Amino acid sequence: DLVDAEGNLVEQGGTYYLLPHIWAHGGGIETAKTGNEPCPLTVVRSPNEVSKGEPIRISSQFLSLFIPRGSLVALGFANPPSCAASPWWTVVDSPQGPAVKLSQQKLPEKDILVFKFEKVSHSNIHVYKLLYCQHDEEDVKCDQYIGIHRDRNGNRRLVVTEENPLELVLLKA
Template sequence: MNKLTLLLFSTISLSLGQGSPDPVLDTDGSLLRSGTEYYILPVFRGMGGGLTLAPTRNESCPLDVVQADLEIDNGLPLTFTPVDPKKGVIQESTDLNIIFSALTICIQSNVWMLEEYEGQRIVTGHGVSGNPGVDTLSNWFKIEKYEDDYKLVFCPTVCDFCKPVCGDIGVTITENGRRRLALSDVPFKVMFKKA
């Protein structure tokens, strides 16, 4: 085999080995789709319900992403928008915006964003949708497989030269007892239920 044939064979083998990421599935086993409303629910019940928006600071606005207090509460419906808006199916480990669909008392976008607050990196609901790059770095999240379920991750790759602090999204308890989402060493195990 000459060098050119070997190089061509190696290149084809490598490109075939790089498949696209697996699609994310909802609780019915259906593909998670861009623009369709879902609830994000905890896999383990008994410690709060689905995800919603609520004030967690010393003021009524902005609203942050929290778990609903009651286990039976599904929270607010939300949609996922991948970094490539032409993709209709949400794939694992792919940058996406997460956007609550409901109206709130605060004038904010309801787009998830990671924000520094009192020494913690918390998930809040006043980010910017789309426009991937350095200016929107804090607005991009990922869904990754975690054991037999999923977890939410902050580790955006929408900027080639940026070095974001990456980590799993978990639940922290605030002074007023709210279960707020933030970067954590303990991932929040979730599932997605069609609204």
């Protein structure tokens, strides 16, 4: 089950701050403008440890008051940057591997309903790793994790990683 930082069920379509489990790992999630992006379309972990980052909308593919047990979810900024077609995060291929981004294009649900929270056993509160579920063509398979990769400019980019999956606690905004 998806539970928030205070022990309560996460609400379908509700807004939360995605913060690290370990205080020293940084602040919340936000955006950054990288490469040739017209506006901040790169999803990153804030450069300020005190910041809760951006309020994030969490939604599953089901009509429910709360995020159903073990369901896939879409994640989006409640207040996205101007040049994004929608608030939803999506995973885009690149020379270095899949990266989490916002898009200037309208996205089909199969391109945004690609995340799944996985509870970490060793914890007293509810902490979750973020799984990325790629296309098993007819359906999907959540066999990868989202992590951080600092680029040349220091931006802590959210990307599919082979090690050190990021962990998060969901604080109601």
